[PDB]
Structures are given as structure tokens and as C-alpha cells.
Design a protein around this ligand. Structure first.
Ligand SMILES: C=C(C)[C@H]1CN[C@H](C(=O)O)[C@H]1CC(=O)O
Ligand SMILES: C=C(C)[C@H]1CN[C@H](C(=O)O)[C@H]1CC(=O)O
Lengths: 146, 78, 181, 44, 48, 48
């Protein structure tokens, strides 16, 4: 039993999922990866959606794990294939395979496109240092002229 | 570590620990870009503006200055 | 006074060279189509408080900012705690929606992978800027002491080595992409 | 004086074409540099 | 063209081209056949 | 194929089936431009 969470493009419902049955009705990176791990390790598997719809965490009061990690420790599922981050608290509790993907904490911003000119940018294909030097040259040559 | 060893799992936990508190990053920065002889490492990333570097125009600035100095000399001889 | 002629001549040479280099490089700028960014790096984003930025409410990213001992991130964490309206979002999609609606008011901190994905999908008006702030990884999880752990581990090794993971990655991210390259 | 004037004209055109040439070639030189290097990609 | 939804694209109502996109198992063409399959307003045209 | 052979029609169908699956395209791209010792079109300019 391979438990996973719905995330794009990790796990997705095919447009025909109403008609499709079982493992066939899920498409995604994680799905193909499940196929590969199964083909290499030679087992038949059940693709399942996590009941809590959460990855993992420990309730502060009860100390009980939630989501797929909980599915793993408490024995609702045999394996976890999903965008699951390796952390210390999780590693203590379950065994992690070597990382199959690299990620980092990164910044997403809006794209400025065409409509935002950045007048300063068009005023400075030359570096601000060059402007410093050219003003200094302007006043210096001005005093040499006077 | 050797297969079946006792130290592998706790040193693993240790690696995760260090990485989560940013120790590994600090170490790499220390032995790579901190001791870097060339310097301006993070510059080439953050400072890559393409555009124009002051260094190229610098020479023109120097022939301008030297021209002003020769102009000073010629001003003296007049 | 030929001193004046040398001043004016050398200075004329100077300004001519400057305006010529400007013309040339503006021609290059317009021809090549370089990427335009408001923000260089995360640390620069800390330095400039003009733009508000946020993370998800429950996740390991917020955990990173919280329990990290690194300076810049501590600064950004100080910024992220006190700001109202609440800068934290329940879903990543919600936060990115906030990035899209704000016209440059809002920046979002998230996993590089999800970032790249949303980057590739319509409207594709949002971009990933700067390098990674840290390095983590996803992995297949197994229950402790289970039989499957080590063989699935080796399977993952093989798949990384023979290029299956990379090809699959290229398939689901950029190749199924909604906009350009 | 017509002589000196046509001298000034010819020299003006001369320096004109030279300056235009410098601006042109510098423009090409700088247009080149921001093109993605072929050798950079492993496949290439 | 396959990697952007900004510009719509279509083929005839019937012929070797539609049959091509339909039967083709190649990635780009499979994708374009999906796009054309679910697209509305219908992108198919009766004549050249 | 020799005139009157038993191989003619099925190899004909084989060549067709191959063409429709893009196999000829991929194989040509393999033997021609994949093993090429000068990269694409751009190599010649050398930036002037
Ligand atoms: C995408 C989400 C919400 C998940 C995926 N991995 C991280 C996890 O294992 O919690 C979460 C992201 C994050 O914490 O920034
Ligand atoms: C013009 C039409 C409808 C015909 C002509 N040849 C192809 C055929 O005979 O199948 C069709 C072109 C196409 O399918 O786009």
C-alpha cells in the first residue's frame, strides 16, 4: 500500500477518472515514480490518498503523528511516495530513502514584463559608478575650463 | 559507515541536525567563498547586470585626466 | 591658447566615447533581450523593506525561518512575524494568488520545485528569482525497520543514475508546461 | 575660403563615418556577449 | 505552439491530419491532440 | 524486393507503419544530427 497526497504535478486526477478504476486513475510525477519503484523492487501496489490530506506533523498535546507519516508508523500504509520533505523530526520516526529530488527554499515574485519600464534601468545601462565618475569629470573639466 | 554498524544511524541524525540549524551552509561558505582569494564570489551572481562595467570606461577617464594634466602643463607654459 | 583646445578636444573625445558606448550597449540591450528583475537576492529582499513577503502557515519552510540561526533569515523572520494583514497562507495556491493580485506588493517564499511548477503554468506571470536559500530533499518514506526501505532505496539510486528521475522531471515540469521556455 | 571649407567638409564626413563605424562595431561586440554561449551546454 | 495556450490552433474536420494527431503516440502530438480534443469553441474547420 | 517475392507487400506495410510512428524521423535524427561533430547552425559565425 503506497499512500500519497494530491498535488500538481505530483498526483493528478485524469479527466476520465470517473470511468477509470484503481491505480490507473492517478497521473503524476509521483505516480510514474511509484511505477518505477514497483518495477524495480517487484511488488504490486495500491495507490491511496492520505486520509488527513496532510504530509506529516506531531500534535503538540497528544504527540500523535498526522498525515502520511502517521499512515506509515501506525500501519495504514506500507510506503510513502509523495513530495515529502526530509526533516529531523520525521526521520527520527520513520526511515527515509536517499533523496530522489533536490529542492530549496526559494523566492517567487511577479514578473514585471513590458508595462513596467524601470526608468532608472534605462537611465543606467552604464553603472552608477560610471555616473559618479562622469559627474566628477564634468565638474573637474569645468574647473579646468574656468 | 559499514553495513550493520551502530554509528551510521545516529551520525545520520547528526547530519540532519546540523543541516537544519544551518551548520553545513556556514561551513561551505567558510571554506569556499570566505577564504576565497579571488573574492567577489556572490558578486558574480547578485551583481551580474551584464550592461557596462566601469572598468572599461576607466581608461578613457584616465586619458581624460592625463589630457587635463597636459592641459595644466600647457597652461603653465603659456 | 592651445591649452583650451587640448581641454576641449580631449573632453570631446571623452564624451564622444561615452555616448558611443551608451549607444552601442543600448543597442545590445535592445537586441539581446535580457531578463529584467526588481530583486536580486533574498538578502537584498531583507535589506529592502519596500516589498512584503510571506510563507505558508503550517510547513517546514516556516519551521526553517523560525529555528534558523542565520542572520538575514532572522531579520526576515522578524519582519514576517509582526506584519498585518497576516502574511501567512493556508494553501500555496492561495499565497501565489496573493502574489498575482498584488502587482508587486507581495513576494512568496516556497519550495523551489512548487515555485518552478507554478512558473511553468498559465498565465506564467510569476518567476523564481535568486538562488536557493537552503538545501533539502524529498525522499520515499518507509516505516522504521520495515523490509522495503533498503531495496526501494537502491531502486532510487539506480533511477537517479540511469537518468529516469531526471527524464521524468523534465516530463512533468517543463514538457507539460503551459508557457514557453 | 573654399579650399579650407571643402577640407573641413571632407574631414567632417571622414570622422563621421569613423565614429559611426566605432559605434556600430562596439554595438555588435556587445550584442555578441549576451548571446548564450554554445560551449556552455554540455550537449554542444 | 504546443507549449503555449495563448494562440489557439486547429485542423480540418476529417482527413489524414486529424487522424495523424489522433493516432500519434508522440508527446508533442499527443498533447496537441488533447488540447484540440477538449477545446471550446470547437477548433475544427470543415474546409481549407 | 525481387519482383514476385512473398516479402514485397508486408515490407511495404512495414515501411508505412514505420513512417507513421515517426521511427524514421527519430532514427534519422540519431544517425545524422545526433552524431554530428559541429553543433547545429550557429557554430560558423564565431561572433565576428
Ligand atoms: C508543498 C507542501 C505544502 C509541502 C511539501 N513538502 C513540505 C513538507 O514536507 O511539509 C511542504 C512545503 C513546505 O513545508 O514549505
Ligand atoms: C484537404 C483534405 C481534407 C485532405 C487532403 N489530403 C488529406 C487526406 O486525403 O486525408 C486531407 C488533408 C488533411 O487531413 O488535413
Amino acid at each position: 500500500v503506497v499512500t500519497t497526497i494530491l498535488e500538481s504535478p505530483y498526483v493528478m486526477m485524469k479527466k476520465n477518472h470517473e470511468m477509470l478504476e484503481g491505480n490507473e486513475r492517478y497521473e503524476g510525477y509521483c505516480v510514474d515514480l511509484a511505477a518505477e519503484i514497483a518495477k524495480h523492487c517487484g511488488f504490486k501496489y495500491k495507490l491511496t490518498i492520505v486520509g488527513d490530506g496532510k504530509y506529516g506533523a506531531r500534535d503538540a498535546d497528544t504527540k500523535i503523528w498526522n498525515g502520511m507519516v502517521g499512515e506509515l508508523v501506525y500501519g495504514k500504509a506500507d510506503i510513502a511516495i509523495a513530495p515529502l520533505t526530509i526533516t529531523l523530526v520525521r526521520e527520527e520516526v520513520i526511515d527515509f530513502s536517499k533523496p530522489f529530488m533536490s529542492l530549496g527554499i526559494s523566492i517567487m515574485i511577479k514578473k514585471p514584463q513590458k508595462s513596467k519600464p524601470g526608468v532608472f534601468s534605462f537611465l543606467d545601462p552604464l553603472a552608477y559608478e560610471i555616473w559618479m565618475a562622469i559627474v566628477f569629470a564634468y565638474i573637474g573639466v569645468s574647473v579646468v575650463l574656468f | 559507515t559499514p553495513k550493520g554498524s551502530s554509528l551510521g544511524t545516529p551520525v545520520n541524525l547528526a547530519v540532519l541536525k546540523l543541516s537544519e540549524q544551518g551548520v553545513l551552509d556556514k561551513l561551505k561558505n567558510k571554506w569556499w567563498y570566505d577564504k576565497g582569494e579571488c573574492g567577489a564570489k556572490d558578486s558574480g551572481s547578485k551583481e551580474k547586470t551584464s550592461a557596462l562595467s566601469l572598468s572599461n570606461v576607466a581608461g578613457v577617464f584616465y586619458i581624460l585626466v592625463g589630457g587635463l594634466g597636459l592641459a595644466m602643463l600647457v597652461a603653465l607654459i603659456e | 591658447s592651445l591649452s583650451a583646445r587640448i581641454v576641449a578636444g580631449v573632453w570631446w573625445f571623452f564624451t564622444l566615447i561615452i555616448i558611443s558606448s551608451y549607444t552601442a550597449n543600448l543597442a545590445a540591450f535592445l537586441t539581446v533581450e535580457r531578463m529584467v528583475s526588481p530583486i536580486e537576492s533574498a538578502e537584498d529582499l531583507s535589506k529592502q523593506t519596500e516589498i512584503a513577503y510571506g510563507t505558508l502557515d503550517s510547513g517546514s519552510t516556516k519551521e526553517f525561518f523560525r529555528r534558523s540561526k542565520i542572520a538575514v533569515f532572522d531579520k526576515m523572520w522578524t519582519y514576517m512575524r509582526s506584519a498585518e494583514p497576516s502574511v501567512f497562507v493556508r494553501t500555496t495556491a492561495e499565497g501565489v494568488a496573493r502574489v498575482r493580485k498584488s502587482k508587486g506588493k507581495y513576494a512568496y517564499l516556497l519550495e523551489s520545485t512548487m515555485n518552478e511548477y507554478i512558473e511553468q503554468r498559465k498565465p506564467c506571470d510569476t518567476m523564481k528569482v535568486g538562488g536557493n536559500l537552503d538545501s533539502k530533499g524529498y525522499g520515499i518514506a518507509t516505516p522504521k525497520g520495515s523490509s522495503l526501505g533498503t531495496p526501494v532505496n537502491l531502486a532510487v539510486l539506480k533511477l537517479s543514475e540511469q537518468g529516469v528521475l531526471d527524464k521524468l522531471k523534465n516530463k512533468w515540469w517543463y514538457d507539460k508546461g503551459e508557457c514557453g521556455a
